C-alpha cells in the first residue's frame, strides 16, 4: 500500500516532467504553505516541488498517472477503490466507472472560477484523516505542481490516497 503510493508519486513526477515540462528545480508560482491533517494516526507529511507553467498539462498528467497506477492494481485490490472513493468525494461508483468519475470530478472541480482565479501564492493543504500502523508510519507527499489548478488535482487524488489507509 505504501509502495503503491510511492509508485504513484513516481508516475506523477515522471509524467509532470515529460508532459508538463516540470522539473525539481523549477520556480513555483504557487508554493505550499501548511500541509497538515485534522486527525493524524501515524502519517508523515512532506512536500515535493515538481513545478511547471502549463496547468492544463499538469492536471492531465495527474489523471494519467492516477489512472495507470489504478489499472496496474489487481482486481481484488482494485475492488477496494469504489468504497474509499465515496468516503472522500461522497459519490457512488463501481470498478469500471471509477476511472472516469474521478476525471469528471477533477476536470469540473479544478476548472471552477474559484480555483482558476486563485492568485494566492502561499496555499495550504488540509486533509481530514490519515491512518497508519504504529511500527510503520505512512509517508504522505504532496507533489506541488506550481498552480492552483494542478494542486487541486493533487489534493483531489490525495483525498483518495488517504482513505485507502483508513
Amino acid at each position, epitope marked *: 500500500i505504501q509502495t503503491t503510493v510511492n509508485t504513484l508519486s513516481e508516475r506523477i513526477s515522471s509524467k509532470l516532467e515529460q508532459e508538463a*515540462n516540470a522539473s525539481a528545480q*523549477t520556480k513555483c*508560482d504557487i508554493e505550499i504553505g501548511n500541509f497538515y491533517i485534522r486527525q493524524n494516526h501515524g502519517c508523515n507529511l512532506t512536500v515535493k516541488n515538481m513545478c*511547471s*507553467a*502549463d496547468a492544463d498539462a499538469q492536471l492531465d498528467a495527474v489523471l494519467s498517472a492516477a489512472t495507470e497506477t489504478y489499472s496496474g492494481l489487481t482486481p481484488e485490490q482494485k475492488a477496494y477503490v469504489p468504497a474509499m472513493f465515496t468516503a472522500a468525494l461522497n459519490i457512488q461508483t463501481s470498478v469500471n466507472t471509477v476511472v472516469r468519475d474521478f476525471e469528471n470530478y477533477v476536470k469540473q472541480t479544478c476548472n471552477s472560477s474559484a480555483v482558476v482565479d486563485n*492568485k494566492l501564492k502561499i496555499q495550504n493543504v488540509i486533509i481530514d484523516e490519515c491512518y497508519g500502523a504504529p511500527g510503520s508510519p505512512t509517508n504522505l507527499e504532496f507533489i506541488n505542481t506550481g498552480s492552483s*489548478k494542478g494542486n487541486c488535482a493533487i489534493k483531489a487524488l490525495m483525498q483518495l490516497t488517504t482513505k485507502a489507509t483508513t
Partner: antibody, heavy 119, light 113 residues
Framework: QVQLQQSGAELVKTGASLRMSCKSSGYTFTRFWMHWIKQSPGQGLEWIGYINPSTGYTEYNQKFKDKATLTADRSSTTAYMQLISLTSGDSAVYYC????????????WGQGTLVTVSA | DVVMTQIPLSLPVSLGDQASISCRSSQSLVHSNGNTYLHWSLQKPGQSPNLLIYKVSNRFSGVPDRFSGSGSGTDFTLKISRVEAEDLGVYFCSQSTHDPWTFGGGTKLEIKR
C-alpha cells in the same frame, strides 16, 4: 523556431496610457513564462515582472507595481504590457522575454518596443 | 535590490587576445536549493541581448567553448578567449537568485585594430 514579435514604436502624451503587445510563435504558448524588461538610457536594464500565460499568474517588481500591468491572450498567443501615468522617465526600449523551463533565465528576447513620452 | 557591479566600464582588446570581465554583487547569489543563478548576456548595437552563459559556468545553445564563466558567492568573471570582431558589444552580468532580478551596468568591448 521561437519568435517573439513585439509591436512597433509608440508616441504617447504625458499622463496617458498605452498597451504594447508581443506575439509568440514556434513554441507552446502555455508551456513557458513571459517576462518584461525595460532598457532606459538613464537607468540600465530593469526587470519589470513576469506572467504565466496558462494561469494568468503574475509577479511584479516593487518598482513597477503601479506602472506596469501584464496580461496574456491564449487565443492569439500574444502577451501584453500596459503602462500607466506615462512620464518622461518612462521613455525607453521595452522587451518581452520568454523564460526557460525553470523560470530563472531569459533565453529568447523580442526585438524591442520603443516608447516615447512627449506632448 | 541586489546590486550588480561590473569592472571595467569598457575594455579595448586585440584580435586573438583574451578578454576578462568581472562582476561583483552585494549579496551571495547562492539559493536555498543550492544553485547560484548568475548569468552573462551580450547585447550588440541594434540587437536585443542574447544569453551566453547561465548559472556561472554553463554555456548556452550554440555558444563557442571559448566563452567560459567562473567564480562563486559574490565575485564572478567572464573570460573570452581568442577575440573575434563579432564579439564587440556590451556584456551584462545578471542575477535571478533574488526577486527583483537585476543587471549590471555592462562592459563595452572595444576591438583594437
Amino acid at each position: 523556431q521561437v519568435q517573439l514579435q513585439q509591436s512597433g514604436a509608440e508616441l504617447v502624451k504625458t499622463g496617458a496610457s498605452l498597451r504594447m503587445s508581443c506575439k509568440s510563435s514556434g513554441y507552446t504558448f502555455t508551456r513557458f513564462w513571459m517576462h518584461w524588461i525595460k532598457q532606459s538610457p538613464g537607468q540600465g536594464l530593469e526587470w519589470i515582472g513576469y506572467i504565466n500565460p496558462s494561469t494568468g499568474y503574475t509577479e511584479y517588481n516593487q518598482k513597477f507595481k503601479d506602472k506596469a500591468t501584464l496580461t496574456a491572450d491564449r487565443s492569439s498567443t500574444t502577451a501584453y504590457m500596459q503602462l500607466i501615468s506615462l512620464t518622461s522617465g518612462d521613455s525607453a526600449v521595452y522587451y518581452c522575454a520568454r523564460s526557460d523551463q525553470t523560470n530563472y533565465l531569459f533565453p529568447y528576447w523580442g526585438q524591442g518596443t520603443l516608447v516615447t513620452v512627449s506632448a | 535590490d541586489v546590486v550588480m557591479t561590473q569592472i571595467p566600464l569598457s575594455l579595448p582588446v586585440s584580435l586573438g587576445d583574451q578578454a576578462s570581465i568581472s562582476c561583483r554583487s552585494s549579496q551571495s547569489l547562492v539559493h536555498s536549493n543550492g544553485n547560484t543563478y548568475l548569468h552573462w548576456s551580450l547585447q550588440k548595437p541594434g540587437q536585443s541581448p542574447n544569453l551566453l552563459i547561465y548559472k556561472v559556468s554553463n554555456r548556452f545553445s550554440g555558444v563557442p567553448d571559448r566563452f567560459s564563466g567562473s567564480g562563486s558567492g559574490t565575485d564572478f568573471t567572464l573570460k573570452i578567449s581568442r577575440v573575434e570582431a563579432e564579439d564587440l558589444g556590451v556584456y551584462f552580468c545578471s542575477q535571478s537568485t533574488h526577486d527583483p532580478w537585476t543587471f549590471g551596468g555592462g562592459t563595452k568591448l572595444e576591438i583594437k585594430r
